[PDB]
């Protein structure tokens, strides 16, 4: 459909796998995070995951949880998150933007409004790590209305039936975690390939070029977050750009 499908079609013609970079708005502070976002985009990021600070990030690892807390103490609001998206959208017109948000904030703000605002500020789709199954259909329906790409989540232990539900739920792409929360996720993706034609990105545990090359050998893309956030924490912008450049190196053929 939109920017996501266009990007994967583009990467395929370039014989590349996608690098999905995840950073948190407001960590270690708004200004520094904005520089970080610009740096990863300038160095090869194909799809951006924009972190929306949340008070109870139970699905994130230690490093990202720190980013959540710090950003919230800096006073980062949903409005600041979208301002950053709008700002980046002007400089990078075709890079797909995925808003990483927990479910509660969407409900608190209001589904219609949340989606309306996201679309107006450049967001292409969402990644909801803790989406309650009993709230999924309603959210998907609203997202469809505002043309926001729904990205279902899979796991190394997803059943064949779940995989088919994931494929039909995905508008343009899917995201699988790499660990049971390697060989296991690789085999799961192969099954996925049998049942689904939509691109799939794999995350968790990526921090070295070797990791990107290995995962990219069977996935259409890799997601990197904690490794980037760590560098951003010390305002090591140059090293961050270097890391993104290196990761992207392991994603070319």
From Swiss-Prot:
Chain coiled-coil ranges: none
Classification lineage? Bacteria, Pseudomonadati, Aquificota, Aquificia, Aquificales
Question: Keyword Amino-acid biosynthesis on this protein?
Answer: yes
Kindly list the biological process annotations in GO that this record carries.
Answer: L-tryptophan biosynthetic process
Keywords attached to this Swiss-Prot or TrEMBL record, sorted alphabetically, are: Amino-acid biosynthesis, Aromatic amino acid biosynthesis, Lyase, Tryptophan biosynthesis
The protein's name = Tryptophan synthase alpha chain
Pathway participation: Amino-acid biosynthesis; L-tryptophan biosynthesis; L-tryptophan from chorismate: step 5/5
One Pfam annotation, family name? Trp_syntA
Q: Name one GO molecular function term.
A: tryptophan synthase activity
* Keyword Lyase attributed: yes
Catalysed reaction per UniProt? (1S,2R)-1-C-(indol-3-yl)glycerol 3-phosphate + L-serine = D-glyceraldehyde 3-phosphate + L-tryptophan + H2O
Which source organism? Answer: Aquifex aeolicus (strain VF5)
Active site positions: 49 (proton acceptor), 60 (proton acceptor)
Q: What's the family?
A: Belongs to the TrpA family.
What biological function has been recorded for the protein in this entry?
The alpha subunit is responsible for the aldol cleavage of indoleglycerol phosphate to indole and glyceraldehyde 3-phosphate.
What EC designation does it have? 4.2.1.20
């Amino acid at each position: 459909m939109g920017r996501i499908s266009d990007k994967f079609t583009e990467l395929k013609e370039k014989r590349e796998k996608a690098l999905v970079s995840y950073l948190m708005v407001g960590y270690p502070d708004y200004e520094t995070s904005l520089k970080a976002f610009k740096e990863v985009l300038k160095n090869g990021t194909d799809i951006l995951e924009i972190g929306f600070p949340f008070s109870d990030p139970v699905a994130d690892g230690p490093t990202i949880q720190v980013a959540h807390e710090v950003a919230l103490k800096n006073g980062i609001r949903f409005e600041d998150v979208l301002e950053l998206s709008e700002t980046l959208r002007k400089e990078f017109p075709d890079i797909p933007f995925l808003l990483m948000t927990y479910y509660n904030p969407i409900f608190r703000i209001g589904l219609e409004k949340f989606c309306r605002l996201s679309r107006e500020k450049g967001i292409d789709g969402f990644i909801v790590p803790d989406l309650p199954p009993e709230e999924a259909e309603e959210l998907k329906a609203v997202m469809k209305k505002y043309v926001l790409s729904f990205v279902p989540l899979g796991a190394p232990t997803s059943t064949r039936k779940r995989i088919k539900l994931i494929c039909e739920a995905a508008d343009e792409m899917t995201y699988f975690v790499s660990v049971t929360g390697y060989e296991r996720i690789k085999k799961k993706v192969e099954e996925y390939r049998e049942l689904c034609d939509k691109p799939v990105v794999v995350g968790f545990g990526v921090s070295k070029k070797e990791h990107a090359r290995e995962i990219g050998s069977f996935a259409d893309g890799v997601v990197v977050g904690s490794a980037l956030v760590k560098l951003a924490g010390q305002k090591k912008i140059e090293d961050l750009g270097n890391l993104v450049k290196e990761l992207k190196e392991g994603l070319r053929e």
